[PDB]
Amino acid sequence: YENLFLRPACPGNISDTSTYNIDGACVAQGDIGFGSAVQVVGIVDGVKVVAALPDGGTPYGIAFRSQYEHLSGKILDGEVCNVVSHGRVWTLTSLGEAPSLFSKLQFGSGGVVTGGSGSAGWTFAGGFVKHEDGYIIEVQVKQNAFIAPP
Amino acid sequence: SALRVFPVTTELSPTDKTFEYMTFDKVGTAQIIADYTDDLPLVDALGTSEFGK
Amino acid sequence: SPKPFFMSDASYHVGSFYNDNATAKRIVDVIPEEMVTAGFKISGVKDEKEFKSLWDSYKIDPSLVDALCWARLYGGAAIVAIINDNRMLTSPVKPGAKLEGVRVYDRFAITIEKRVTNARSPRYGEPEIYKVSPGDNIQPYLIHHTRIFIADGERVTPQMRKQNQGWGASVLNKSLIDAICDYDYCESLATQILRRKQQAVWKVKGLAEMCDDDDAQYAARLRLAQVDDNSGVGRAIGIDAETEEYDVLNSDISGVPEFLSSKMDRIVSLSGIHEIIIKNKNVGGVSASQNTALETFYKLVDRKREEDYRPLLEFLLPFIVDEQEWSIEFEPLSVPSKKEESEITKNNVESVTKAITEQIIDLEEARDTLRSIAPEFKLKDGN
Amino acid sequence: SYHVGSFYNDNATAKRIVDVIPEEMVTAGFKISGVKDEKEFKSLWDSYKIDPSLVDALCWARLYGGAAIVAIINDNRMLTSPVKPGAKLEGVRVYDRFAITIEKRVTNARSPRYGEPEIYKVSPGDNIQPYLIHHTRIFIADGERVTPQMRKQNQGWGASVLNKSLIDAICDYDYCESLATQILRRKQQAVWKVKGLAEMCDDDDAQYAARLRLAQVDDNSGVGRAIGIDAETEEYDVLNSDISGVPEFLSSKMDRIVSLSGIHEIIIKNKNVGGVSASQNTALETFYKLVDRKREEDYRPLLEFLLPFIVDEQEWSIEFEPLSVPSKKEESEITKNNVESVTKAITEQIIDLEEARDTLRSIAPEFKLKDGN
Amino acid sequence: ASYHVGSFYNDNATAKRIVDVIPEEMVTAGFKISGVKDEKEFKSLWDSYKIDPSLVDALCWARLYGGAAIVAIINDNRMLTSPVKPGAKLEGVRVYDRFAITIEKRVTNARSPRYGEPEIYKVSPGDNIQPYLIHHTRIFIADGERVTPQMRKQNQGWGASVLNKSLIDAICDYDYCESLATQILRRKQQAVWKVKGLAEMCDDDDAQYAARLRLAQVDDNSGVGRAIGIDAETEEYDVLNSDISGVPEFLSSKMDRIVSLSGIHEIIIKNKNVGGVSASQNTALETFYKLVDRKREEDYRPLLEFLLPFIVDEQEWSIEFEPLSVPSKKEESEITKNNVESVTKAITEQIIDLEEARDTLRSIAPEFKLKDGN
Amino acid sequence: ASYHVGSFYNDNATAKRIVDVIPEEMVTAGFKISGVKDEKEFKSLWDSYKIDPSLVDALCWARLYGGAAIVAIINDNRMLTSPVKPGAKLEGVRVYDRFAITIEKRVTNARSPRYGEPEIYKVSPGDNIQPYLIHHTRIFIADGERVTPQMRKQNQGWGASVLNKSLIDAICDYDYCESLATQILRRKQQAVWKVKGLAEMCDDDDAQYAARLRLAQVDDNSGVGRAIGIDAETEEYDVLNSDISGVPEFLSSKMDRIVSLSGIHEIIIKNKNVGGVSASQNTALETFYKLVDRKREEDYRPLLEFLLPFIVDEQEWSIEFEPLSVPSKKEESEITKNNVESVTKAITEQIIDLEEARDTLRSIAPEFKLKDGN
């Protein structure tokens, strides 16, 4: 009774076949890069409008890699977008060394992981590899973890 | 009434995601000549395209 | 793995393998098409001209072809026949001989609804009612046992037969899949080996002093490419003995065609259909052995035909023939020809009446005998 | 090594080895002598349509070493009781070795049937209670002979055709294939030497950039391309090895497989020899003689077990078709020869037409003939 | 990159052959019909209509694009949208590719087994004319090859090209291999000239231009019967060489992969006779013939049962495909002798009369014509 | 790097053979006409018009340029733009290339099946004669090979040259390989002569001239039977050598590529007997005959239906293509013996009478001259 692994290890894709959720009814304002956190700025007709994470926002999900929706290499303004709201996913990071297992991550500007000492939110899942003179980490996203401030 | 007021085409396959169409243009002129002529005015053409989703 | 929802996940791995690779295409479509196109003959009927007329009027052979093909591929297929009858399609069928339409479905569209375990009838233990779910925005429906017939592939042990819901397995087994996959890897390796036959090395003292992605380095590499393009047999390249050297090294190639031939031999040996029908290359070293290879192929395809083609015959023909007792015989699967048919017909016409003129073997049945063996001699029926 | 079923289902060579024999054995056919006519016999046979069950019955007997068939007759008695004389049948079913056992053993002195079981207990499963059958309804199909000290140890049952020698001889073949593929992959090697390269920190941007640049430059190398290096600090070397004898080695391994299995190349490797025109006919005829040999021992018991349950004719014999592929032109000469032989000289001797017709139509011709005088 | 079938077809000769060699021979093979009163007028109408090039093109596009449409116009006093009443009239036939036909109307009613089958076809040829509508009875469609039903539905009931990815890239690799072979032969031998101090040359000056001038000049005059002089102290002249072997076998193996994947064999695609045997290529060509017959039985007939009922007033007729074998003037001579001997060797002994004997002798198409009569 | 095909055609020889071998043999093969009252006057009239050179080069330029035209002039009392009235008259035929023909007038009538097919042809022969206009029925157009329609309508509904890019560069590479092989042979051996202080000697002066003349003189007199002297202390004389192998095999592989792309086999394109087998080039030839007849049926017959009804007054007739097989006296005599014994070995007992037996015997082409009569 076990969960299979998923081999390609590129940023912006899913790392396991555990319970995951993909919110595919969204549109982008500005440009978004695969493997970055996004935030919900508004809702029109059951569609969520997302943008790259600013300072002071609450992350909602992580952009997901697809080879039909995004032929350019990144997500462009006015495009339908895939966002992962629950599951394990490879994220871009600016950190230098792996944090403690099952710690709480903190997101800098642009939707990159820079902290490992948060109070509550998403947690580190134990994966830490290297990409392009930069690193990739593995994050575990949960649905109601970050709550929008009143 | 949209599909009954405006015409409907089917010149796209379901796997298509972009389309384009082209338009053309031309230039030229003419003059009055004699029997022994060596210079005559010329003509050309152009082109342009647009896109969709 | 994440997949698009409109592409529902049901054996599309093997489906894409089939519709993409060509060797799989051949190995799965070689047998059923030739099997059906071989033809057959029927005995006990008053005449066969009207039989052929009604047969090619119904013209169902493409449906039979892809039915057999999908049964061989998925390990199971369903053929559904509708009859001209004034009853609901759920009820059984009264005696009669009518056809109006027949259609095909793959393995994934059929399920079992009602099961029988009644003691007296030996029919217990096989399903009674089949629940078909075509999809395509039409409600799934139910069929009696007699109306439709289920075509299966190759035999498996009861242990997995019972867990596969009484359905066989795909003809592409794991060993076949891996052996097929290995050939492309070997070909790519061969191409790389051919490319890497010869290498040239250029050594320049102090060359590493240069900054990367810089004007001097760009100039140097452009010069290297330029001088590399213009060298050859009739051209020479000058260097400086003190500082730079230009060496060249090379490796040989041998045995690669034999290696790939051996891999193809493994493929054909595990497949079971032989070289002059899979690789499509005549042996060339002998004049009269390829024909014997052909008759071996015909023997094996006949052995396979005896197990699968007949059930369609006994399932469909009783719905189209009005007389009571008949025979289904198969044409001896061999390509005939001018010469051999001309002299064989000469032999038959002399054998049929060279010595019968002495006994009770008389004309009204001698003619029937002579035109029973299908001749080129057309004859009008009569005395 | 492991469960034979998994091997049978996974490896295709096992499929071939266990299946090619019984299918051809049963599809060969037969004729019967002593019966009034045969068209109604064929009608009954193909109305009963039992040959798929016969096929996998013999196949499972060959594989597992034992199989059982249950035949149910139109008799107005409860099933454990024996069967009165008669010629009826309505169904037959095939069970593997695992679902059969013995219940009562008879060693009575007067009966020569002493020492073999009377009633069989069958437990097919499928949420139906196991039941008991009298031996008259049961025929037990065995595999191949074994020593009696093992026969009685296996409850009077045979053994698998996949012995351990066959199993591991088949097994090492794919290992040899993988070794051959590795030999092919390791033909040529490139080596790059860079003094000082040891001083890089592990898993840092410098090392990743260096290895990426190495991969990029190795991508564009070739016969028409040249690569420059530094004289003092780095060197580029190439190593190569020869490959030879691997095809012959693999062919020898396949030859061992053939010899130990017992079925030859034209049917197992499915490769014509090519160097001869008319020796494959002899190869095949050896194949048919061996398959006829194995047929005579095991297929016939099914014949005398089943046929008397359908035929009311008192005394008859079963003759086996001469297992050779027939052909139009050759059978044309055969028919001409037979029709001349039957009456070139019987004109003067008392053999009359009333029996000459039977003689000519007994040897199955393509010349039909209505019954008469 | 190189995946556009349209450009690839007319830019690669191998693709041309591999795609169109089959249907043209298929159609030129020939056939005949039984149950017809006579054949002379039949062939007269056939070669008056002269639609076989269009048939060839239709089959070619069916094999290439996976789908093609054929349209026939009839002598009927109704609108072209209306169905066709029974009759035997023909006026002309035209062919369109996969890109000009679509669907309009559906039938899904219970009683007809035609439920779920296309009813009305929307033809849009283009060519600055209004696209129009055609009943199901008028147009027939030729498909490509079978695919999985899931792809069949995704491709709106149209097949796939015979040029699959394996065929395309196997074809592509051959050109790379031959280019590498040419480079290999070019780089067989290399001459090196080493001169201490040569690095002191200024780039792009008269000195360097003169140096390379002299180098090229002295290179152009060397050979077997000529010698070159050098200075021992300062310069030297070396030559390095590498061998070649096995590339004929390599390219032959690539071609063998091509033929094995294609399914058309060597004496038809590579066009070499094997040469080492006298009479095995006849068996090879008859293998080609049996496979071409196998595929013909699949796709050529539907055109025949679609078109023939529209030209013949005769009620019931049958088709046979002429057995594809090259006839040798001589061998047809002896087979005619054998047949004319068999037809009346012993028929003079029973009720088989000339009334049927003449029909027998003129049925198997002889070189002996016979005026109709008794 | 694209070159006009005409220059390559009239320059290179292999291109000449590839473009020319098929049409001329195809036309010289011949034909027979059925339904004719007599054939002697047919052949007399045919070689009276003697149009086969024009036919040959018409087919040749159709094959090369992808388009050719023939103008057929008729005895009629009307202008050339008018259609042609029924009749059988001919007076001359001429041939024009691809470049001199265009389309003038458009027909789109839905009533006729002629919509989308040009009605008036605009000919501009040039050579100081005014271009003129011709009706459809007076002109025939010969096209090349099949192309995709998206290129067909782009090329004004016209074919393409049979010399495609793959054929062109495959041909071009062969000459480069031959030149490279010649260079490989030339560079087999090299003699090096090194002398201390040789660099001190200055450029282009008397001393250098004398030294190089001496070197040439001593090189001209070297060999097996002659030796040379050297000073051990200062100068050294060495020889470097290289081996040659596999070049003929590589060239044979390139010829394989040429024949594979061309589609016509080796004993016709290289014209070299295999030599190792006596009775396989005969089936090689019959494969060639099959392919050439397959191509002939597509395009040569349209000339027959275009011109034949314009010369024959008979209502009905048919075209039969002669069996394209080389006829050897001996076997011809044997076949004639077989035919004559078959035609009357068993007609003595039925209604097959002399008035039709004579027709049968003189229909199958005999050497047996026989006057017409009963």
Short mmCIF file of C-alpha atoms in Angstrom, two decimals, chain E residues 18-342:
data_model
loop_
_atom_site.label_atom_id
_atom_site.label_comp_id
_atom_site.label_asym_id
_atom_site.label_seq_id
_atom_site.Cartn_x
_atom_site.Cartn_y
_atom_site.Cartn_z
CA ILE E 18 7.18 5.00 -50.39
CA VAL E 19 3.83 6.80 -50.40
CA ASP E 20 2.64 6.50 -54.00
CA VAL E 21 4.23 3.33 -55.41
CA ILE E 22 1.40 1.17 -54.10
CA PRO E 23 -1.99 2.65 -55.17
CA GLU E 24 -1.03 3.33 -58.79
CA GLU E 25 0.00 -0.28 -59.34
CA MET E 26 -3.13 -1.30 -57.42
CA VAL E 27 -5.39 0.46 -59.90
CA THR E 28 -3.41 -0.47 -63.01
CA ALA E 29 -3.66 -4.15 -61.99
CA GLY E 30 -7.18 -4.61 -63.42
CA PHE E 31 -10.28 -6.66 -62.66
CA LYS E 32 -13.48 -7.88 -64.25
CA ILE E 33 -17.18 -8.33 -63.50
CA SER E 34 -19.38 -11.41 -63.78
CA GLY E 35 -23.10 -11.31 -64.48
CA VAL E 36 -22.81 -8.73 -67.27
CA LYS E 37 -24.17 -9.42 -70.74
CA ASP E 38 -21.00 -8.23 -72.48
CA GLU E 39 -17.72 -6.46 -71.75
CA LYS E 40 -16.99 -4.56 -74.98
CA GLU E 41 -19.49 -1.78 -74.28
CA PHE E 42 -18.45 -1.85 -70.61
CA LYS E 43 -14.83 -1.02 -71.45
CA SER E 44 -16.11 1.48 -74.03
CA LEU E 45 -17.95 3.42 -71.33
CA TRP E 46 -15.01 3.01 -68.95
CA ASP E 47 -12.35 4.44 -71.25
CA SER E 48 -14.81 7.09 -72.42
CA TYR E 49 -15.16 8.22 -68.80
CA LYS E 50 -11.36 8.05 -68.19
CA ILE E 51 -11.35 8.73 -64.44
CA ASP E 52 -8.43 6.48 -63.47
CA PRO E 53 -5.90 9.33 -62.91
CA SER E 54 -8.38 10.86 -60.48
CA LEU E 55 -8.75 7.47 -58.80
CA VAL E 56 -4.96 7.26 -58.48
CA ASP E 57 -4.80 10.72 -56.93
CA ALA E 58 -7.66 9.96 -54.53
CA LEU E 59 -5.94 6.80 -53.30
CA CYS E 60 -2.62 8.65 -53.01
CA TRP E 61 -4.08 11.38 -50.81
CA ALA E 62 -5.97 8.76 -48.80
CA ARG E 63 -2.69 6.98 -48.06
CA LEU E 64 -0.80 10.22 -47.38
CA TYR E 65 -3.16 12.48 -45.42
CA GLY E 66 -5.23 9.68 -43.89
CA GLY E 67 -8.43 10.83 -45.58
CA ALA E 68 -9.81 11.92 -48.95
CA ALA E 69 -13.20 12.63 -50.50
CA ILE E 70 -14.53 11.61 -53.91
CA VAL E 71 -17.62 13.22 -55.45
CA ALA E 72 -19.67 11.94 -58.40
CA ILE E 73 -22.25 13.91 -60.39
CA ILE E 74 -25.30 12.13 -61.80
CA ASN E 75 -27.90 12.82 -64.49
CA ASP E 76 -30.78 13.71 -62.18
CA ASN E 77 -33.35 16.51 -62.30
CA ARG E 78 -33.17 17.50 -58.62
CA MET E 79 -31.02 19.62 -56.34
CA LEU E 80 -27.54 18.32 -55.55
CA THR E 81 -28.49 18.40 -51.86
CA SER E 82 -31.32 15.92 -52.45
CA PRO E 83 -30.69 12.16 -52.19
CA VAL E 84 -30.28 9.95 -55.27
CA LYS E 85 -33.14 7.91 -56.73
CA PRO E 86 -32.29 4.49 -58.22
CA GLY E 87 -30.73 4.66 -61.66
CA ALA E 88 -27.61 4.17 -63.77
CA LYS E 89 -26.25 7.55 -64.88
CA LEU E 90 -22.83 9.19 -64.63
CA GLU E 91 -21.42 12.55 -65.69
CA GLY E 92 -18.10 13.10 -63.90
CA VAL E 93 -16.05 12.59 -60.77
CA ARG E 94 -13.82 14.96 -58.79
CA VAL E 95 -11.45 14.50 -55.84
CA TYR E 96 -10.76 16.61 -52.74
CA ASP E 97 -8.25 16.20 -49.94
CA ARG E 98 -8.77 15.94 -46.17
CA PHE E 99 -8.85 19.72 -45.80
CA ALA E 100 -12.08 20.55 -47.66
CA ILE E 101 -14.83 18.38 -46.07
CA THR E 102 -16.77 18.77 -42.82
CA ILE E 103 -19.96 17.67 -41.06
CA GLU E 104 -23.35 19.34 -40.76
CA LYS E 105 -26.23 17.09 -39.70
CA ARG E 106 -26.54 13.98 -37.51
CA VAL E 107 -28.83 10.95 -37.49
CA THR E 108 -29.25 9.18 -34.14
CA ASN E 109 -32.80 7.81 -34.36
CA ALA E 110 -33.52 4.39 -32.90
CA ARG E 111 -35.03 2.38 -35.75
CA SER E 112 -32.30 2.95 -38.33
CA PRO E 113 -28.94 1.21 -37.75
CA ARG E 114 -27.51 4.35 -39.40
CA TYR E 115 -27.88 6.19 -36.09
CA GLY E 116 -24.64 7.98 -35.25
CA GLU E 117 -23.53 7.91 -38.90
CA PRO E 118 -22.84 11.09 -40.91
CA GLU E 119 -25.79 12.44 -42.88
CA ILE E 120 -24.96 15.73 -44.63
CA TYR E 121 -21.49 16.78 -45.78
CA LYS E 122 -20.31 20.39 -45.87
CA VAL E 123 -17.90 20.77 -48.79
CA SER E 124 -15.73 23.91 -48.80
CA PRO E 125 -13.40 23.57 -51.81
CA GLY E 126 -12.48 27.24 -51.60
CA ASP E 127 -11.44 28.63 -55.01
CA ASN E 128 -13.64 31.72 -54.49
CA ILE E 129 -16.88 29.72 -54.78
CA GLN E 130 -19.51 29.32 -52.09
CA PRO E 131 -19.11 26.12 -50.06
CA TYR E 132 -22.19 23.92 -50.31
CA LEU E 133 -23.95 20.83 -48.99
CA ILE E 134 -24.10 17.24 -50.22
CA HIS E 135 -26.25 14.26 -49.26
CA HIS E 136 -24.57 11.13 -47.91
CA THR E 137 -25.44 9.20 -51.07
CA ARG E 138 -23.36 11.37 -53.40
CA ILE E 139 -19.90 11.47 -51.77
CA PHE E 140 -17.76 8.54 -50.67
CA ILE E 141 -14.81 8.91 -48.28
CA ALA E 142 -11.54 6.96 -48.32
CA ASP E 143 -9.72 6.60 -45.00
CA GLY E 144 -6.12 5.83 -44.08
CA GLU E 145 -5.24 3.16 -41.53
CA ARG E 146 -7.03 1.93 -38.44
CA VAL E 147 -6.26 3.60 -35.11
CA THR E 148 -7.43 3.10 -31.55
CA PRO E 149 -11.07 4.20 -31.15
CA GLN E 150 -10.01 6.92 -28.71
CA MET E 151 -7.85 8.53 -31.41
CA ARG E 152 -10.53 7.76 -34.01
CA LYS E 153 -12.97 9.95 -32.08
CA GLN E 154 -10.33 12.60 -31.39
CA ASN E 155 -9.64 12.84 -35.14
CA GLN E 156 -13.38 13.24 -35.95
CA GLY E 157 -13.44 9.79 -37.52
CA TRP E 158 -10.42 10.28 -39.78
CA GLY E 159 -7.32 8.13 -39.99
CA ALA E 160 -3.61 8.90 -39.68
CA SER E 161 -0.75 9.38 -42.11
CA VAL E 162 1.37 6.40 -43.12
CA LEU E 163 4.40 8.58 -42.26
CA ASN E 164 4.64 7.99 -38.52
CA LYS E 165 7.41 9.34 -36.31
CA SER E 166 9.53 6.19 -36.53
CA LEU E 167 9.43 6.28 -40.33
CA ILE E 168 10.19 10.01 -40.42
CA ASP E 169 13.21 9.93 -38.12
CA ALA E 170 14.53 6.67 -39.59
CA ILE E 171 14.47 8.39 -42.99
CA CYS E 172 16.11 11.49 -41.51
CA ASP E 173 19.01 9.58 -39.92
CA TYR E 174 20.09 8.24 -43.34
CA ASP E 175 20.98 11.72 -44.59
CA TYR E 176 23.00 12.41 -41.45
CA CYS E 177 24.86 9.13 -41.96
CA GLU E 178 25.74 9.86 -45.59
CA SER E 179 26.86 13.39 -44.73
CA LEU E 180 29.14 11.93 -42.06
CA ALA E 181 30.48 9.49 -44.65
CA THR E 182 31.34 12.35 -47.01
CA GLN E 183 33.07 14.20 -44.16
CA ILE E 184 34.95 11.00 -43.30
CA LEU E 185 36.30 10.69 -46.83
CA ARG E 186 37.19 14.39 -46.86
CA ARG E 187 39.21 14.05 -43.64
CA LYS E 188 41.14 10.95 -44.75
CA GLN E 189 44.54 12.69 -44.79
CA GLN E 190 45.86 15.87 -43.17
CA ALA E 191 49.20 17.63 -43.67
CA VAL E 192 50.82 19.72 -40.92
CA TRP E 193 53.61 22.28 -41.34
CA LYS E 194 55.40 23.42 -38.18
CA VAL E 195 57.58 26.55 -38.16
CA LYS E 196 59.13 27.91 -34.97
CA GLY E 197 58.40 31.62 -34.72
CA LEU E 198 55.35 31.47 -36.99
CA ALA E 199 53.36 32.98 -34.10
CA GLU E 200 55.20 36.28 -34.56
CA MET E 201 53.19 37.07 -37.70
CA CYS E 202 50.93 40.09 -37.48
CA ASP E 203 47.31 39.31 -38.24
CA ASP E 204 46.01 40.29 -41.68
CA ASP E 205 49.21 41.80 -43.06
CA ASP E 206 51.22 41.42 -46.24
CA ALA E 207 53.59 39.01 -44.50
CA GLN E 208 50.85 36.59 -43.44
CA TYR E 209 49.04 36.84 -46.78
CA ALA E 210 52.28 36.02 -48.60
CA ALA E 211 52.97 33.14 -46.22
CA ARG E 212 49.59 31.50 -46.83
CA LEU E 213 49.96 32.26 -50.55
CA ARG E 214 53.24 30.34 -50.65
CA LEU E 215 51.78 27.53 -48.54
CA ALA E 216 48.86 27.04 -50.94
CA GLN E 217 51.17 27.26 -53.96
CA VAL E 218 53.61 24.63 -52.68
CA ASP E 219 50.70 22.41 -51.67
CA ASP E 220 49.19 22.56 -55.16
CA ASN E 221 52.40 21.27 -56.81
CA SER E 222 53.10 18.26 -54.58
CA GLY E 223 52.37 14.65 -55.42
CA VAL E 224 53.94 11.28 -56.06
CA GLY E 225 56.43 12.58 -58.62
CA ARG E 226 57.33 15.82 -56.81
CA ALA E 227 59.36 16.64 -53.71
CA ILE E 228 59.33 19.49 -51.19
CA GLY E 229 62.29 20.99 -49.36
CA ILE E 230 62.31 22.26 -45.79
CA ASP E 231 64.79 23.71 -43.31
CA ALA E 232 65.90 21.22 -40.68
CA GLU E 233 66.61 23.72 -37.91
CA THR E 234 63.38 25.72 -37.97
CA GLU E 235 60.56 23.80 -39.67
CA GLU E 236 59.18 20.35 -40.40
CA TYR E 237 56.43 18.82 -42.54
CA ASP E 238 54.36 15.91 -41.25
CA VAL E 239 51.36 13.98 -42.56
CA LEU E 240 48.69 12.12 -40.58
CA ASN E 241 46.17 9.66 -41.95
CA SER E 242 43.20 7.56 -40.86
CA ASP E 243 41.53 4.60 -42.54
CA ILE E 244 37.96 3.87 -43.62
CA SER E 245 36.06 0.57 -43.55
CA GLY E 246 32.61 -0.77 -42.77
CA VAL E 247 30.59 2.25 -43.94
CA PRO E 248 29.05 0.32 -46.88
CA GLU E 249 27.73 -2.21 -44.36
CA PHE E 250 26.61 0.60 -42.06
CA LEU E 251 24.59 2.34 -44.78
CA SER E 252 23.21 -1.00 -45.94
CA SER E 253 22.01 -1.65 -42.39
CA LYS E 254 20.32 1.76 -42.30
CA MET E 255 18.54 1.01 -45.57
CA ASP E 256 17.54 -2.39 -44.17
CA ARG E 257 15.96 -0.68 -41.16
CA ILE E 258 14.09 1.60 -43.56
CA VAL E 259 12.73 -1.32 -45.57
CA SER E 260 11.81 -3.36 -42.49
CA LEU E 261 9.89 -0.46 -40.98
CA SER E 262 8.23 0.44 -44.29
CA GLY E 263 7.01 -3.02 -45.25
CA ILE E 264 8.09 -2.78 -48.91
CA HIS E 265 11.14 -4.84 -49.69
CA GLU E 266 14.44 -4.28 -51.42
CA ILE E 267 13.84 -5.18 -55.07
CA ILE E 268 11.10 -2.55 -54.98
CA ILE E 269 12.61 0.21 -52.79
CA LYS E 270 16.40 -0.13 -53.11
CA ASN E 271 15.94 -1.43 -56.67
CA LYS E 272 18.87 -3.85 -56.58
CA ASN E 273 18.39 -7.39 -57.77
CA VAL E 274 19.91 -9.77 -55.23
CA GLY E 275 22.03 -11.25 -58.03
CA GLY E 276 23.37 -14.19 -56.03
CA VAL E 277 20.39 -16.38 -56.94
CA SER E 278 18.58 -17.05 -60.21
CA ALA E 279 14.90 -17.53 -59.35
CA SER E 280 14.15 -16.23 -55.85
CA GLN E 281 13.23 -12.67 -56.88
CA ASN E 282 10.10 -14.11 -58.52
CA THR E 283 9.07 -15.45 -55.11
CA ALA E 284 9.94 -12.06 -53.60
CA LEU E 285 7.71 -10.26 -56.09
CA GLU E 286 4.89 -12.73 -55.50
CA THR E 287 5.19 -12.01 -51.76
CA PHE E 288 4.87 -8.33 -52.63
CA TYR E 289 1.87 -9.30 -54.76
CA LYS E 290 0.13 -11.23 -52.00
CA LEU E 291 0.53 -8.33 -49.57
CA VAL E 292 -0.68 -5.81 -52.16
CA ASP E 293 -3.70 -8.04 -52.75
CA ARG E 294 -4.31 -8.23 -48.99
CA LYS E 295 -4.43 -4.46 -48.67
CA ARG E 296 -6.34 -4.04 -51.95
CA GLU E 297 -9.16 -6.24 -50.65
CA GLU E 298 -9.44 -3.70 -47.82
CA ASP E 299 -9.70 -0.34 -49.60
CA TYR E 300 -9.99 -0.64 -53.39
CA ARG E 301 -13.29 -2.53 -53.41
CA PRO E 302 -15.42 0.14 -51.65
CA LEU E 303 -14.78 2.48 -54.58
CA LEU E 304 -16.01 -0.30 -56.87
CA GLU E 305 -19.23 -0.98 -54.96
CA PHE E 306 -19.71 2.79 -54.69
CA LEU E 307 -19.32 3.58 -58.39
CA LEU E 308 -20.32 0.47 -60.37
CA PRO E 309 -24.02 0.34 -59.29
CA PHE E 310 -24.31 3.79 -60.90
CA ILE E 311 -23.27 2.70 -64.42
CA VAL E 312 -24.70 -0.79 -64.92
CA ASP E 313 -28.42 -1.39 -65.38
CA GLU E 314 -27.86 -5.11 -64.80
CA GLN E 315 -29.33 -6.32 -61.52
CA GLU E 316 -26.85 -8.68 -59.83
CA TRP E 317 -23.13 -8.74 -60.60
CA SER E 318 -19.89 -9.88 -58.97
CA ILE E 319 -16.29 -8.65 -58.92
CA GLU E 320 -13.05 -10.55 -59.20
CA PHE E 321 -9.57 -9.03 -59.07
CA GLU E 322 -7.29 -10.22 -61.85
CA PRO E 323 -4.54 -12.46 -60.39
CA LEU E 324 -1.49 -10.19 -60.41
CA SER E 325 1.16 -12.04 -62.40
CA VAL E 326 3.24 -10.82 -65.34
CA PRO E 327 2.15 -12.82 -68.36
CA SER E 328 4.91 -14.22 -70.66
CA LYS E 329 3.74 -14.29 -74.27
CA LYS E 330 5.10 -17.82 -74.38
CA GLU E 331 3.60 -19.04 -71.12
CA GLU E 332 0.15 -17.68 -71.90
CA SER E 333 0.53 -19.52 -75.20
CA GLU E 334 1.07 -22.88 -73.51
CA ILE E 335 -1.65 -22.29 -70.91
CA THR E 336 -4.07 -21.48 -73.74
CA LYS E 337 -3.09 -24.78 -75.37
CA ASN E 338 -3.71 -26.61 -72.09
CA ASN E 339 -7.10 -24.97 -71.58
CA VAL E 340 -8.29 -25.59 -75.15
CA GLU E 341 -7.27 -29.23 -74.75
CA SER E 342 -9.03 -29.56 -71.39
#
